[PDB]
Design a binder for this molecule. Structure first.
Ligand code: LEU
Ligand code: LEU
Ligand code: ZN
Lengths: 577, 574
């Protein structure tokens, strides 16, 4: 159980701080400077640098993220993850560890053999330095027009001591021999353009002078040039300290590595201390050229730096990430499919709750910011969606990620969706729950229902539907025509249209009378069991009356066909409120 | 949908970077220096400062957290959260906004009347500046032996302009009148040790000179002393930029505020950019005294800074957080219960996977590390458990937080059908179909042929050729149907009536020995547009002259889609 800290306060601890020494065994842990080495960089320049271009991005989802899963990816999930990364615009993709995993081997064969790799994409494969594992890495890759062989070995103070029980020259030689084997294998395969990446694995627990020594030594072997450079990848395999010390280390490495013009400086931060995004951002500022990571932070334990957070962290401060995130829910769905692990509710940019507001004053402020943007657009004759986003509490326009701002209204166990289904038998499409909470925002169960009926069910002006005649074609693929008796602002009129179904027909019938309903989406469900249940239909439409608003329509009827036509009328009249 | 970036690379972009420009509207966003202002700070020292003591913690779970919740806390859940925070060792605890929330108001009354505050615990209540909201706040604390009164008003360039439509002097007066009110109310409420906190709300979006001037001014009103300090709380209401810049801002504020010995400088990071922890850590190194956050990062949108992450980031680097995390499961289980939101699997220290190693290589290193630790403990006659933790891949001993090192040794139907096929299968159809498929890995193409084979292709025992639907013109009228069908190859006319086309069709089926007891029904568009196709889903118990089935029907017509989903169900049944 948890017991209240009860030791004396520190010596010199101020009077206004009543905290107590805990009995946590801090003696078992040391400051990073004593665990590893003091990193002094008093002339650092990274704190004075604001990032202004995308890094070279490398997605490791298919290796590092895969390694990390309760259920590793099936051949299908591998392939889906691969096509998402390509389609988002990543150019370096680490596709597996084929010398260590027959399923990685099969996967790399597949993508080579079936032409899944675009000509601007370089596949990357991980290997350890054992020469036969390196041989089989090249074999995996046979037929690739180009590939990065990523080789590595652990170089930490603690691993050299207790894992390898090895000296500095011995641990360096693992890597130089690895490098040598890479050079000889590349020459045995002139059909692939080969590139190299070397990681001093557990870099963050390694002396920087030794990290430099091993990398320089590896570079001497590979012999890279400005046109044919090497990636030195510097991982925080364990994130051991604050991101500034990581940054200081990258700046030192950037200035001190031999042959710096023939180096792509790559970062690979983990998240043990919760600051993996900060390490990537600070370390990029420090002179790195490239960042390895995963969509939504997937990877071993606390994960790899999140490539979504890093990309939109650029977008939202005016830098093009060079990666498409304009449908973040498609990315999220694909990612959760592949990894079979949910993105958290509060995950930056992509979590369920991140475009929500629960505070009444946040809501009021957001509405004023939105209004003031809309006034400025009319003045400038511009589309508000093209202008400087200026809205309190929302770092970005959610529309720019295919998401919607949502004010969440508490209903006096609860919530709109929930009381609507339970007490009224309506399962409201999510974007209908959004739009209607916006209405309540301008509450008890009864108040919400009354408001709901006011917006969606009761209105009869400008459009009312009295009756209609549906002529459905008997033959599949045939035309449906409709004549309907409608009142337009109380005036009885006769409307007619045709379409591939009854909703299409009724939509074309209304166009002739000055209501343009451009239908975006449609849902329907029974309100009970039995062939004679009521049908509730929901229609999303961008509607124009003789400017255009997106609104929802709701209709309820004994007939599935009719419930759908009611929804349309509902929609039309909602657009006029 | 996601469209591959195709725009020209930037001028000067290296040859080794084949990345293309995205079509994201980056011109709607400006660098921070231009949205707000460039960095004021000359000679920063936070970069060379390594944290060696714990800050003063304040838990804002009961207000800032609670306000964030889909299901807000019951009185029981609050009490449970209050008690957890106390027991962990928190001395400052935000308990409500009682002036704006009656349930907040009750809670405060309750713990004051119940005598539930330990003598070392200060409660904190939030108010806005309006004089009536201040008085209601002091009334809620009526009788408290000590309390923090946190008043705030928004100061950002953006909110002055579009929220308050107010100039700098106006907004400062909102603040200093609040403080005046607080002073007056403090004087009308005897014997309680009233303590103040002022936040220039939306601080990261405010000019530094201006935030300092507002703060100085409020401090001149409170007239705090080193014995009775004021709290100035400087929130990243939105986390707007990198943590180094926040920290530059805090160092500047620390060096420049008036009456610095009477000031407890407080940080309130949010996580919009995923860097709230780093903002807190760099910021505390920059000279702050105090940090407000939530257990496991709860709070609006992306959340407040994680209190757990921060204290355990001190612990694992040899610094006492002065808070007990010896049993993080208990913390996590209580937090999830109070919040009714889960700690993510990857959450530092707390999450399901953070002491798990799936790699054989890692698992080997781990044992090599633990064996070397044992060797050493045996040498010195020591408990391993009291020795320097030296284990690759594991920053802490999972036993140090109540946890254990774990060496670990769907077909995706919903996702695939919807992505590849435009179908949102009902949940029970999802279950039913993925049963069919666990028996049949199956490729997405394979899963398609299997589905079409079950639900789409069968024309026996039932095939619908065509039908005439005589729909009721008038709401509530009968709909009739006549259909030409084939029953195991045999052309038959069926006909029937009911309250809609699906009832008409099910009535007709019944004459021909096909009893369809409809249990549920769904329909949706497969695309945007009034001419989209409909997918319809019908669940029935079917008696073919009582099997529970789904049918799926697809058609350009809403009506006809529904009829096909009937036929599909009948054939499923057989
Ligand atoms: C899918 C639905 C929007 C409409 C369908 N095309 C019909 O008219 O019935
Ligand atoms: C809601 C559905 C189960 C059926 C509706 N009574 C119709 O016949 O169209
Ligand atoms: Zn890694």
């Amino acid at each position: 159980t948890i017991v209240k800290p009860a030791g004396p306060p520190r010596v010199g601890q101020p009077s206004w701080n009543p905290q107590r020494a805990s009995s946590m065994p801090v003696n078992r842990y040391r400051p990073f400077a004593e665990e590893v080495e003091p990193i002094r960089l008093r002339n650092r320049t990274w704190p004075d640098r604001v990032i202004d271009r995308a890094p070279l991005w490398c997605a490791v989802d298919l290796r590092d993220g895969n390694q990390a899963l309760i259920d590793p990816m099936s051949p299908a999930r591998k392939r889906r993850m691969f096509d998402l990364l390509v389609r988002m615009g990543y150019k370096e993709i680490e596709v597996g560890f084929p010398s260590a995993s027959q399923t990685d081997f099969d996967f790399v064969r597949e993508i080579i053999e079936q032409g899944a790799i675009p000509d601007d994409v370089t596949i990357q494969v991980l290997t350890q330095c054992r020469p036969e594992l390196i041989e089989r890495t090249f074999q995996a890759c046979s037929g690739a027009p180009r590939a990065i062989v990523h080789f590595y070995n652990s170089t930490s103070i603690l691993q050299r001591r207790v894992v390898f029980r090895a000296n500095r020259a011995e641990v360096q030689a693992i890597a130089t021999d690895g490098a040598r084997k890479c050079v000889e294998q590349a020459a045995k395969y002139p059909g692939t353009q080969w590139r190299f990446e070397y990681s001093p694995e557990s870099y963050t627990g390694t002396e920087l002078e030794y990290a430099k020594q091993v990398c320089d030594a590896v570079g001497e072997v590979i012999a890279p040039t400005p046109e044919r450079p090497i990636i030195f990848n510097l991982p925080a395999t364990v994130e051991m300290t604050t991101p500034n010390v990581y940054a200081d280390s990258i700046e030192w490495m950037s200035r001190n590595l031999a042959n710096r013009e023939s180096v792509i400086l790559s970062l690979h931060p983990h998240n043990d201390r919760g600051t993996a995004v900060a390490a990537a951002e600070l370390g990029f500022a420090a002179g790195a050229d490239r960042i390895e990571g995963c969509l939504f932070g997937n990877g071993e334990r606390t994960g790899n730096v999140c490539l979504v957070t890093l990309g939109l962290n650029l977008f939202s401060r005016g830098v093009d990430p060079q990666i498409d995130f304009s449908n973040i829910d498609e990315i999220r769905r694909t990612v959760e499919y592949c990894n079979q692990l949910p993105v958290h509710e509060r995950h930056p940019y992509g979590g369920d709750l991140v475009y929500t507001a629960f505070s009444g004053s946040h809501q009021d402020a957001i509405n004023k910011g939105l209004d003031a943007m809309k006034l400025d657009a009319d003045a400038a004759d511009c589309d508000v969606d093209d202008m400087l986003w200026q809205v309190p509490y929302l770092p970005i326009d959610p529309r720019d990620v295919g998401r919607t701002y949502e004010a969440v209204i508490r209903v006096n166990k609860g919530g709109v969706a929930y009381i609507m289904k339970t007490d009224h038998g309506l399962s409201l499409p999510r974007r209908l729950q959004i739009e209607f909470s916006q209405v309540i925002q301008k509450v008890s169960p009864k108040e919400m229902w009354d408001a709901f009926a006011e917006e969606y069910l009761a209105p009869v002006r400008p459009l009312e539907r009295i009756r209609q005649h549906v002529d459905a074609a008997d033959d599949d693929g045939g035309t449906t025509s409709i004549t309907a008796t409608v009142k337009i602002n109380g005036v009885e009129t006769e409307i007619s249209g045709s379409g591939n179904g009854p909703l299409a027909a009724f939509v074309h019938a209304l166009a002739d009378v000055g209501f343009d309903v451009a239908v975006l989406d449609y849902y329907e469900h029974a309100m009970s069991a039995g062939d004679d249940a009521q049908a509730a239909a929901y229609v999303e439409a961008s509607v124009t009356i003789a400017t255009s608003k997106t609104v929802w329509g709701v209709g309820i009827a004994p007939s599935i066909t009719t419930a759908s036509l009611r929804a349309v009328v509902s929609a039309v009249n909602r657009a006029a409120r």
